[PDB]
Each structure stands twice: as C-alpha cells, then as structure tokens.
Design an enzyme around this catalytic site. Structure first.
Site, PDB file in Angstrom:
ATOM      1  N   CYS A  21      14.024 -25.390  -7.198  1.00  9.47           N
ATOM      2  CA  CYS A  21      13.043 -24.608  -6.542  1.00  9.47           C
ATOM      3  C   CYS A  21      12.388 -25.448  -5.477  1.00  9.47           C
ATOM      4  O   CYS A  21      11.757 -26.419  -5.847  1.00  9.47           O
ATOM      5  CB  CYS A  21      12.006 -24.099  -7.536  1.00  9.47           C
ATOM      6  SG  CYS A  21      10.556 -23.338  -6.721  1.00  9.47           S
ATOM      7  N   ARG A  75       7.797 -25.853  -5.151  1.00  8.20           N
ATOM      8  CA  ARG A  75       7.073 -26.346  -6.295  1.00  8.20           C
ATOM      9  C   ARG A  75       5.797 -27.064  -5.935  1.00  8.20           C
ATOM     10  O   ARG A  75       5.049 -27.447  -6.822  1.00  8.20           O
ATOM     11  CB  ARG A  75       7.912 -27.336  -7.075  1.00  8.20           C
ATOM     12  CG  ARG A  75       8.938 -26.618  -7.914  1.00  8.20           C
ATOM     13  CD  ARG A  75       9.791 -27.592  -8.706  1.00  8.20           C
ATOM     14  NE  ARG A  75      10.849 -28.139  -7.911  1.00  8.20           N
ATOM     15  CZ  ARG A  75      11.572 -29.178  -8.220  1.00  8.20           C
ATOM     16  NH1 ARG A  75      11.292 -29.884  -9.318  1.00  8.20           N
ATOM     17  NH2 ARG A  75      12.581 -29.526  -7.418  1.00  8.20           N
ATOM     18  N   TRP A 135       6.498 -16.034  -3.432  1.00 10.91           N
ATOM     19  CA  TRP A 135       6.766 -15.344  -2.161  1.00 10.91           C
ATOM     20  C   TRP A 135       8.104 -15.834  -1.567  1.00 10.91           C
ATOM     21  O   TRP A 135       8.630 -16.887  -1.940  1.00 10.91           O
ATOM     22  CB  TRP A 135       5.625 -15.504  -1.197  1.00 10.91           C
ATOM     23  CG  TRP A 135       5.158 -16.916  -0.992  1.00 10.91           C
ATOM     24  CD1 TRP A 135       5.723 -17.849  -0.173  1.00 10.91           C
ATOM     25  CD2 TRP A 135       4.038 -17.551  -1.619  1.00 10.91           C
ATOM     26  NE1 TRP A 135       5.044 -19.026  -0.269  1.00 10.91           N
ATOM     27  CE2 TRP A 135       3.971 -18.863  -1.111  1.00 10.91           C
ATOM     28  CE3 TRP A 135       3.070 -17.137  -2.548  1.00 10.91           C
ATOM     29  CZ2 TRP A 135       2.996 -19.777  -1.524  1.00 10.91           C
ATOM     30  CZ3 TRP A 135       2.066 -18.039  -2.926  1.00 10.91           C
ATOM     31  CH2 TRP A 135       2.041 -19.340  -2.419  1.00 10.91           C
ATOM     32  N   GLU A 149      16.257 -16.556   2.581  1.00  9.47           N
ATOM     33  CA  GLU A 149      16.716 -15.893   1.403  1.00  9.47           C
ATOM     34  C   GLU A 149      17.202 -14.457   1.735  1.00  9.47           C
ATOM     35  O   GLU A 149      18.206 -14.013   1.225  1.00  9.47           O
ATOM     36  CB  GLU A 149      15.584 -15.804   0.385  1.00  9.47           C
ATOM     37  CG  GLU A 149      15.213 -17.111  -0.293  1.00  9.47           C
ATOM     38  CD  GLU A 149      14.188 -16.913  -1.400  1.00  9.47           C
ATOM     39  OE1 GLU A 149      14.585 -16.510  -2.523  1.00  9.47           O
ATOM     40  OE2 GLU A 149      13.005 -17.257  -1.186  1.00  9.47           O
TER      41      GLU A 149
HETATM   42  C1  HEM Z   1       5.367 -19.534  -4.377  1.00 13.29           C
HETATM   43  C2  HEM Z   1       6.448 -19.531  -3.616  1.00 13.29           C
HETATM   44  C3  HEM Z   1       7.801 -19.914  -4.069  1.00 13.29           C
HETATM   45  C4  HEM Z   1       8.740 -20.291  -3.189  1.00 13.29           C
HETATM   46  C5  HEM Z   1       8.539 -20.295  -1.689  1.00 13.29           C
HETATM   47  C6  HEM Z   1       9.945 -20.559  -3.955  1.00 13.29           C
HETATM   48  C7  HEM Z   1      11.127 -20.949  -3.348  1.00 13.29           C
HETATM   49  C8  HEM Z   1      12.312 -20.920  -4.057  1.00 13.29           C
HETATM   50  C9  HEM Z   1      13.566 -20.633  -3.496  1.00 13.29           C
HETATM   51  C10 HEM Z   1      13.937 -20.414  -2.041  1.00 13.29           C
HETATM   52  C11 HEM Z   1      14.488 -20.585  -4.503  1.00 13.29           C
HETATM   53  C12 HEM Z   1      15.938 -20.328  -4.257  1.00 13.29           C
HETATM   54  C13 HEM Z   1      16.351 -18.876  -4.710  1.00 13.29           C
HETATM   55  C14 HEM Z   1      17.798 -18.428  -4.504  1.00 13.29           C
HETATM   56  O1  HEM Z   1      18.536 -18.959  -3.621  1.00 13.29           O
HETATM   57  O2  HEM Z   1      18.244 -17.489  -5.236  1.00 13.29           O
HETATM   58  C15 HEM Z   1      13.801 -20.861  -5.698  1.00 13.29           C
HETATM   59  C16 HEM Z   1      14.448 -20.890  -6.938  1.00 13.29           C
HETATM   60  C17 HEM Z   1      13.696 -20.936  -8.118  1.00 13.29           C
HETATM   61  N1  HEM Z   1      12.320 -21.033  -8.234  1.00 13.29           N
HETATM   62 FE1  HEM Z   1      11.008 -20.854  -6.796  1.00 13.29          FE
HETATM   63  N2  HEM Z   1       9.657 -20.561  -5.275  1.00 13.29           N
HETATM   64  C18 HEM Z   1       8.434 -20.036  -5.427  1.00 13.29           C
HETATM   65  C19 HEM Z   1       7.815 -19.757  -6.636  1.00 13.29           C
HETATM   66  C20 HEM Z   1       8.347 -19.952  -7.897  1.00 13.29           C
HETATM   67  C21 HEM Z   1       7.648 -19.656  -9.053  1.00 13.29           C
HETATM   68  C22 HEM Z   1       6.306 -19.016  -9.085  1.00 13.29           C
HETATM   69  C23 HEM Z   1       8.468 -20.044 -10.088  1.00 13.29           C
HETATM   70  C24 HEM Z   1       8.208 -19.967 -11.540  1.00 13.29           C
HETATM   71  C25 HEM Z   1       7.060 -19.600 -12.086  1.00 13.29           C
HETATM   72  C26 HEM Z   1       9.711 -20.540  -9.524  1.00 13.29           C
HETATM   73  C27 HEM Z   1      10.872 -20.989 -10.204  1.00 13.29           C
HETATM   74  C28 HEM Z   1      12.098 -21.050  -9.576  1.00 13.29           C
HETATM   75  C29 HEM Z   1      13.345 -21.109 -10.336  1.00 13.29           C
HETATM   76  C30 HEM Z   1      13.470 -21.271 -11.843  1.00 13.29           C
HETATM   77  C31 HEM Z   1      14.342 -21.068  -9.426  1.00 13.29           C
HETATM   78  C32 HEM Z   1      15.816 -21.114  -9.719  1.00 13.29           C
HETATM   79  C33 HEM Z   1      16.318 -19.709 -10.009  1.00 13.29           C
HETATM   80  C34 HEM Z   1      17.818 -19.678 -10.142  1.00 13.29           C
HETATM   81  O3  HEM Z   1      18.549 -20.590 -10.651  1.00 13.29           O
HETATM   82  O4  HEM Z   1      18.314 -18.654  -9.665  1.00 13.29           O
HETATM   83  N3  HEM Z   1       9.581 -20.506  -8.191  1.00 13.29           N
HETATM   84  N4  HEM Z   1      12.435 -21.100  -5.423  1.00 13.29           N
HETATM   85  C1  LIG Z   2      21.964 -13.744  -7.699  1.00 12.39           C
HETATM   86  N1  LIG Z   2      21.203 -14.895  -7.246  1.00 12.39           N
HETATM   87  C2  LIG Z   2      19.780 -14.838  -6.882  1.00 12.39           C
HETATM   88  C3  LIG Z   2      19.577 -14.274  -5.482  1.00 12.39           C
HETATM   89  N2  LIG Z   2      19.132 -12.866  -5.545  1.00 12.39           N
HETATM   90  C4  LIG Z   2      20.196 -11.872  -5.472  1.00 12.39           C
HETATM   91  C5  LIG Z   2      17.759 -12.461  -5.554  1.00 12.39           C
HETATM   92  C6  LIG Z   2      17.327 -11.128  -5.300  1.00 12.39           C
HETATM   93  N3  LIG Z   2      16.020 -10.791  -5.282  1.00 12.39           N
HETATM   94  C7  LIG Z   2      15.066 -11.713  -5.489  1.00 12.39           C
HETATM   95  C8  LIG Z   2      15.422 -13.059  -5.743  1.00 12.39           C
HETATM   96  C9  LIG Z   2      14.327 -14.089  -6.007  1.00 12.39           C
HETATM   97  C10 LIG Z   2      14.584 -15.603  -5.836  1.00 12.39           C
HETATM   98  C11 LIG Z   2      13.156 -16.191  -5.617  1.00 12.39           C
HETATM   99  C12 LIG Z   2      12.299 -16.300  -6.727  1.00 12.39           C
HETATM  100  C13 LIG Z   2      11.006 -16.820  -6.598  1.00 12.39           C
HETATM  101  C14 LIG Z   2      10.147 -16.863  -7.820  1.00 12.39           C
HETATM  102  C15 LIG Z   2      10.569 -17.149  -5.364  1.00 12.39           C
HETATM  103  C16 LIG Z   2      11.422 -17.053  -4.273  1.00 12.39           C
HETATM  104  N4  LIG Z   2      11.020 -17.434  -3.059  1.00 12.39           N
HETATM  105  N5  LIG Z   2      12.693 -16.591  -4.414  1.00 12.39           N
HETATM  106  C17 LIG Z   2      16.766 -13.424  -5.790  1.00 12.39           C
END
Ligand code: HEM
Ligand SMILES: CNCCN(C)c1cncc(CCc2cc(C)cc(N)n2)c1
Ligand code: HEM
Ligand SMILES: CNCCN(C)c1cncc(CCc2cc(C)cc(N)n2)c1
Ligand SMILES: C[C@H](O)[C@H](O)[C@H]1CNc2nc(N)[nH]c(=O)c2N1
Ligand SMILES: C[C@H](O)[C@H](O)[C@H]1CNc2nc(N)[nH]c(=O)c2N1
Ligand SMILES: [Zn+2]
Lengths: 411, 407
Positions: free
Chosen positions: B106, B109, B278, B283
């Site tokens: 992520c 963070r 957000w 994305e």
């Molecule tokens: C507040 C703004 C946030 C931004 C800008 C952000 C940004 C990102 C981005 C760009 C990804 C990549 C997603 C993808 O390619 O599918 C990501 C993955 C992730 N973030 Fe965040 N994040 C945010 C908040 C959070 C929050 C609030 C949590 C948990 C409470 C979190 C937990 C994760 C996790 C676990 C992943 C990996 C998900 C996966 O393997 O598909 N993030 N984050």
């Molecule tokens: C299948 N892999 C994930 C990508 N995907 C299809 C997808 C669709 N809709 C929403 C998300 C959210 C990923 C995400 C989560 C959080 C907490 C923050 C953020 N900036 N992006 C992912």
C-alpha cells in the site's frame, strides 16, 4: 517440482521446471524478499564440478551427451585442472557459453535475440594496446553504420586474481560529466567520478555536454592505460521531434551503441572479467532514464516549459506529458537516421513471445520483473501483467567490484 | 541480519532491523524469487496473542507492567476455557491501524494512524451487516471529502460461522457477456454478477450498474442488498481541453473499498473487514480504463485524438494513456472528490518510509505494487530499494466464498 506463472491479462498459465537447475543464490529467503535490491581465485575442488556441469550441458545441447567425445573431453579438462589449476575452453564452448549467459540474463528484455551474437575471441590479447584494437574492431562491427549487430569480445580469463583484464569504463561509449565549483554539473552527472579518474590519468577534457570518454584499459593486472576511440567509429544521433521544431534546439544527442563493459562472464567455473557486450537500444533507456532521471540530464522541466504545460501542480501530469514527447523524439530520430532502435511496446511483446517459447522448449525463462517492465507506461505493456520467476542459471553475467576500488597500483 | 536499502537517485542509505520480527513466509527462497507473483488451535493461539499483546503494551509504554501481565494472564485463561478470546476496543483499534501500517502493497500508508475504526462485532444478521456498511460508506464518502475507515465484523469461531462480504470491493460495476460475442460493463466482474443474478438480482444490463452486496453472516447463506443509490457517489469523466471526452460517457465511483481481505490480529481472524481510503488517479485511469481485460478504452480515445495508430513507435498508446489520466484527475478535483496523483502519493510514501526507518527501524514494501503503473521512473519510489516481509497484524487474501461455501 513444478512451479506455475500466470498472466493476469490473458489467464494463460505456464509451468516452470528449469528452476530445478538453478544454483547461485537470489538474496531472498522465506522471511525476506530482496527482489528490488540492485546489487546483492577458485580452488581445484570447486572448479571440476563447475566444469563438469557446463560440459554436460554443452554436450547435451549438441546431442552428444555421453559420447566418446564428451567423455574424452571431461577427462582432458580434469587432467588440465589437476595439473595447472585451471583449463581452457574450446572456441565452440566459449561461443555456446557466451550465448547462454545472455539467454540466462534475467534482467534482459532483449533475449529473443540471444542466439544471434557474434563472439570475438580475444583470449590471445596481452596488452592494453591490444585490448584497444579488439574494442575498436568490436565497435565498428557492432555499429555497422547504424544496422546494429549484437556482439561480445572476450579477453583472457582470471588466473590468480592479480593479473585481471578489465575495462574500467562501465560502458564502452559514455559522455563525460564535470562537477562545477558552484555545484552544478556539466554533461552526464552519473559519470563525474569516472571522468575525474580519466582526467587524473591524463585525459584532456573538452569540457562540454557530450564529450565521449576515453577508454581506460587494464591488461594482465597492470595499471590501466588511456585510449581515445576514433571519433569516426562513434555513431551519434541528434535528437529532434517530428512536430516540435524547437526540440532540436535543446542541443540533445545520444550515441547509437549500448555496450556494457563492467560485468564478469562465468562459463564452466572460469571468470572472464573483461567481456564487453553490445546490442541496440530500447528507446526508454535514453528517453526516460538518460534524459529524465533527476540524477542524469534531467531535462523534463525545460521540455515542459517549451511545451507551455501547466507546471504549478503535479496533477496536471506535465511530467508525464513531456516524458512521452521526449521518447517520441528519440524513436523518431534514430529511425530517421537509420540506426537500429526498438520501442518498448515492440520489445516487451517480443519478450513475452520469447518467454512463452522458452517455457515450451526449455522448461523456463528466469526473469526479473523489476528490470523487465519498462520505466514508463508499465501496465500498457504485456510484461506488467506477467508473473515471472527469478533464479540464477549458469553460464552467467555477474557484477564485480569497480576496479578503482580494488586495483593494486604498480606506479 | 541488519540490512541496508539504498535510494539510487539520492544515495541515501537506510538500515532495516524491523524485518527480524517478520513472522509469516514470503514465498521466496534462496533459489527462487517470487516477488512478481500476485498470490503466493489453543496451542497455536496463545503465542500469537502474547506476540500481539507484548507489542501493544510496548506501544503504550507499559511493557512488563502489572496491567500487561494481568491482561496476558486473562487472555490465557480465556483461551484455555473458551478456545478463543475477545480483544478490548483499544486492542482492536491498534490492531487495525497496524495491519494498514504493515500492508506492504500500500503506497498510502503515510495516513495509517488516521483510520476510523467501526466495531461491528455485535452484528448478528446480514441485514445488520448492510446497515453497518451503508454507514461506513456514508461516513467515508463525507460528501466527497473522503476519510479512511474500516468496519470490523465478528471474528472466525469454528470456521463454519464466518462473516463474509462476497463482493471483492463495496462498490464495483456489473459485467455481462453479450450474444453479440462481446462483454458489456466491467469484464472482470462477469462471474460475480452471474452469482448475483443466480441469487435473485434483477440486473439493469447497462455499462455502469453498481452491484448489490452479498452478505453472509454467521456462516449462513449470503443475502442480497442494494446499497442506497444516493450513498454511491459517482464522477462523470471529462477532460479540461478535449470537449469530446465526455461523449465516451465514462464515469467511475469515488469510494475505493476493499471487502475480501482477512484481518489477522493477535491470532484472531476477522474474515469480514471492509476498508476504504481514497483513490490514486492511475488506479482508474491506467488500470480500470486501460487494462485490456477491463474497460479497454485506449483505442477509442486514440482515434478521437487522431493519432497515428499504424505503428507502436509513434507512442499513440502512451499519449492516449496520459490524457485519460489527466481527465480522471480533473474530473474528481472539479467535483471536489478526494483523489491523489501518483507523483504526490509516491513523494508521500518516501517521506513515510524515512519516518518508519527512523522511528520503527523499517517499512515492509513490495516494489512491484508500490511503483505506479505509468511513468515509474519519474516517481521517486522507482529508485528506492525496498525490502518486502510479512508483519502481523496484517491484511491477508482468503479464498473466495463461492468456492468455499456449503449452501
Ligand atoms: C487513504 C488513502 C489510501 C491510498 C491513497 C491507498 C493507496 C493504495 C493503492 C494505490 C493500492 C494499490 C491498489 C491496487 O492496485 O489494486 C493500495 C493497496 C492496498 N492498501 Fe491502500 N491506500 C489507502 C488507504 C488504505 C487503507 C485505509 C487501508 C486499510 C485500512 C489500506 C490497505 C491496503 C491494502 C491491504 C492494499 C493491498 C490490497 C491488495 O493486495 O489488493 N489502504 N493502497
Ligand atoms: C482485482 N484487483 C484490485 C483492483 N480492483 C479491481 C479494484 C476495484 N475497485 C476498487 C479497488 C480498491 C483498491 C484501493 C483500496 C484502498 C483502500 C485505497 C485505494 N486507493 N485503492 C480495487
Ligand atoms: C540486442 C538488443 C538488446 C536489447 C534491446 C536489450 C535490452 C536490454 C535492456 C533495455 C536492458 C536494461 C538496461 C538498463 O536498465 O540499464 C538490458 C539488460 C541487460 N542485457 Fe540486454 N538487450 C540487448 C542485447 C544484449 C546483449 C547482446 C547482451 C549480452 C550478450 C545483453 C545482456 C544484458 C544484461 C547482462 C543486462 C543486465 C545489465 C545490468 O545488470 O546492468 N543484452 N537488456
Ligand atoms: C547502471 N545501469 C545503467 C547504465 N547506463 C546509464 C547505460 C549507459 N550506456 C549504455 C547502457 C546500455 C545498457 C544496455 C546494454 C545492452 C547490451 C543493450 C541495451 N539495450 N542496453 C547503459
Ligand atoms: C504480475 C504482476 O505482479 C501483476 O501484474 C501486478 C504488478 N503490479 C501491480 N501493482 C499494483 N499496485 N496493483 C496490481 O494489481 C499489480 N499487478
Ligand atoms: C531500486 C530499483 O531496483 C532500481 O531503481 C531499479 C528498478 N528497475 C530497473 N530497471 C532497469 N531496466 N534498469 C534499472 O536501472 C532499474 N533500476
Ligand atoms: Zn524474492
């Protein structure tokens, strides 16, 4: 054991068996992945199994495994090691060995080309002046007036580690960098230290923005000596843009021949510490990395200015817009001057077809995703979505220490 | 044991010690690196609780205190009798925030300590789940000023009474195979839509139909609920220069919310824990719109810009990519919906890394996911070495429930 990799765009799944032949270490463990880390005198005892592994691989490739010729060759090498501590490769083996190090080079996106490599055998070279002549000849053959041909030149192997051949340059062709007293850099900032070494040793620096560095060459552990590549052998491309006529007034050019000179080639346990190799450029190497890295020529601002992009907030994506125009310019310029170049779409498409082929005929293709995915437009290239397995096969290209850190100066 | 990471742009070298607390496995070995692979009892529980409570009491500067020893004792007592335990509210909150802090994939963070935690451990039915989630969505949406949030439903028991949100994200668009041969909507969601229709959903058959929620409570068969339309904030996509862009008729939702991950705290498993933040602009603009398996719009855009599409080397794909991404950001910003561009987020992340090295001794990061899907090397993360390792509390992938569920 079987390992699978999936492509998340096509759902195609491939099965790797070749990783079972992996030997060197990755840097990773079950507790830590070092996949983004840039950088992680043999006894007889260690050498004969390495020689044996290599020769078994070579004899299988020529469909002669376990033949009399194979057996006689193992015995001949065995006797050479026990009596001299080393051995010499036959020319055929050296060729196979160099092509396979390329085939096995996981950070290389260009590997669809691996069996088309011209190998120049420079193991009779004894002086730095002799090295210069081999390198000049390499450069002229590889350049081929813009119709670039892949090649490698192979200088004598390591003996006791005090008689190493080495090309001190990291690449055969690079531009000088000069750190000014005010802290500004003239030319390529990444080459300042090496430019200083060349100057110390007698190079008379023109002190411009694109001065081709001299070769600094060490033969047989002696102190290195300086040579200027003949300007006429150094093909260069002035960079212009197909729509923007001001692009040419940026004063940019780049050299046509990408040539790595600082890596160590391991074949059958032998170490070829001087083995310059060249191919042709992928456009992003110049247009993204050489021109737009903040630590390199760093031209993004100037370009965006000239385009009159809104530069008050990053969210206008002005850097991204300028980046694309620069890269367009590099491809246009090289194509216009009939110098070989490949674009990152073409190159990554070719790689994926290469990879698929290797999986079928070879059981695998080790690849380092971090290096293979291009540095712009990642996910619109197919390698982004391709799962890869990174492991180490020999023969191989390896990093070695910079020679200015380890050389014993004779004076 | 102690490991160095270098930034190749700035030469700054940092030293990572935190990895020696890595617990679960990476999937790599000394022979093979799996860095680019997407998906690599009472006896077992007490050491996990102890591990966690130790870190918690450490974090509030009461390590080896009586309240620390007393809590350890109480939880051990509780597991010995009941085979499980309950977290205190304070522990749950710390745990959820740390699971975000430890999320190697992520980039956002820097925001980890500012997470609003909604405790839904009293929830017993699927209708309750729906109410909680709507409240999360409304809270997090906040009229376009987005706020990070997680909602935590009841922890796994014997594993036959799992709460799950069958949906992968709270808000997604339906996909439908057409007779025509092609796919209408989001092609990634065809199989899940079919499940929804198979479960009763009256499908609208349009390009941007928000899917209903399928909520499983207490191991029960999942049930269908429609998120109130007025709580699903959407943005129509337009471009600040190309007036034709709006005629592609594109929109996307403002709320990114993951709903299929498992939250692990002190050995307890929270199988339904939707969380949201957000968007980062790429994305939507790079992945949702331009993936070939997704809305796949590059060709249509390129044509509208009248680029030479005869040859890859004109970089027409690249040119259309950037404009689509400029349109995403402008549209969200004009409607006052929180969004971050990849330059800003990645600069933030590098500040966050430095902070975490300085104050925690490191920061697990997965470079493959952290570097954005366009313009990699013009962002600072590209040049930053990162170590990836698994710390707990954590968010984990789990099997999809249609595969697991016994109806
Ligand atoms: C507040 C703004 C946030 C931004 C800008 C952000 C940004 C990102 C981005 C760009 C990804 C990549 C997603 C993808 O390619 O599918 C990501 C993955 C992730 N973030 Fe965040 N994040 C945010 C908040 C959070 C929050 C609030 C949590 C948990 C409470 C979190 C937990 C994760 C996790 C676990 C992943 C990996 C998900 C996966 O393997 O598909 N993030 N984050
Ligand atoms: C299948 N892999 C994930 C990508 N995907 C299809 C997808 C669709 N809709 C929403 C998300 C959210 C990923 C995400 C989560 C959080 C907490 C923050 C953020 N900036 N992006 C992912
Ligand atoms: C023929 C066209 C070729 C193309 C387009 C090509 C493309 C590339 C590119 C783009 C890189 C990454 C460079 C960087 O970021 O610095 C690379 C790496 C490399 N390729 Fe090639 N390659 C080609 C030929 C060769 C040849 C001839 C060899 C050796 C015989 C070779 C061996 C390597 C090695 C060893 C690396 C890793 C360099 C390192 O670790 O710094 N490649 N290839
Ligand atoms: C440290 N790595 C970057 C080196 N660099 C700035 C650099 C300079 N000049 C030339 C190259 C070529 C790298 C390379 C080598 C080969 C054989 C082919 C290819 N397309 N590029 C790289
Ligand atoms: C094979 C590869 O791991 C896969 O395409 C990854 C690459 N990097 C990614 N990075 C992010 N942020 N999101 C992703 O879905 C992916 N996909
Ligand atoms: C830290 C990171 O590994 C480093 O910046 C890498 C990333 N990927 C790369 N990829 C290529 N092809 N060449 C490079 O120099 C790098 N540098
Ligand atoms: Zn690894």
């Amino acid at each position: 054991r079987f390992l699978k990799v999936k492509n998340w765009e096509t759902d195609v799944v491939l099965t790797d068996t070749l990783h079972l032949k992996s030997t060197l270490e990755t840097g990773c463990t079950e507790h830590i992945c070092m996949g983004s880390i840039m950088l992680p005198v043999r006894t007889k005892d260690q050498l004969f199994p390495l020689a044996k592994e290599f020769l078994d691989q070579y004899y299988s490739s020529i469909k002669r495994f376990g033949s009399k010729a194979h057996m006689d060759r193992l015995e001949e090498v065995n006797k050479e090691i026990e009596s001299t501590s080393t051995y010499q490769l036959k020319d055929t083996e050296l060729i196979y060995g160099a092509k396979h190090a390329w085939r096995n080079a996981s950070r290389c996106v260009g590997r669809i080309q691996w069996s088309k490599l011209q190998v120049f055998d420079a193991r009779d070279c004894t002086t730095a002046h002799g090295m210069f002549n081999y390198i000049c000849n390499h450069v002229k053959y590889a350049t081929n007036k813009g119709n670039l041909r892949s090649a490698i030149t192979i200088f004598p192997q390591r003996t006791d580690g005090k008689h190493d051949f080495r090309v001190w340059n990291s690449q055969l062709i690079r531009y000088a960098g000069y750190k000014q007293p005010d802290g500004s850099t003239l030319g390529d900032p990444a080459n300042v230290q090496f430019t200083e070494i060349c100057i110390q040793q007698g190079w008379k620096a023109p002190r411009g923005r694109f001065d081709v560095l001299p070769l600094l060459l060490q033969a047989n552990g002696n102190d290195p000596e300086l040579f200027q590549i003949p300007p006429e052998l150094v093909l260069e491309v002035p960079i212009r843009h197909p729509k923007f006529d001001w692009f040419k007034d940026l004063g940019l050019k780049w050299y046509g021949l990408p040539a790595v000179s600082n890596m160590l080639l391991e074949i059958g346990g032998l170490e070829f510490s001087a083995c310059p190799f060249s191919g042709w450029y992928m456009g992003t190497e110049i247009g993204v990395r050489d021109y737009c890295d903040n630590s390199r020529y760093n031209i993004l601002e100037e370009v965006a200015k000239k385009m009159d992009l809104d530069m008050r907030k990053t969210s206008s994506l002005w850097k991204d817009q300028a980046l694309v125009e620069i890269n367009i310019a590099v491809l246009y310029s090289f194509q216009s001057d009939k110098v070989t170049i490949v674009d990152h779409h073409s190159a990554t498409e070719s790689f994926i077809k290469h990879m698929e082929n290797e999986y079928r005929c070879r059981g695998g293709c080790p690849a380092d995703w971090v290096w293979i995915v291009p540095p712009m437009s990642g996910s619109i290239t197919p390698v982004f979505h391709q799962e890869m397995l990174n492991y180490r096969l020999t023969p191989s290209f390896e990093y070695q220490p910079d020679p200015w850190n380890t050389h014993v100066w004779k004076g």
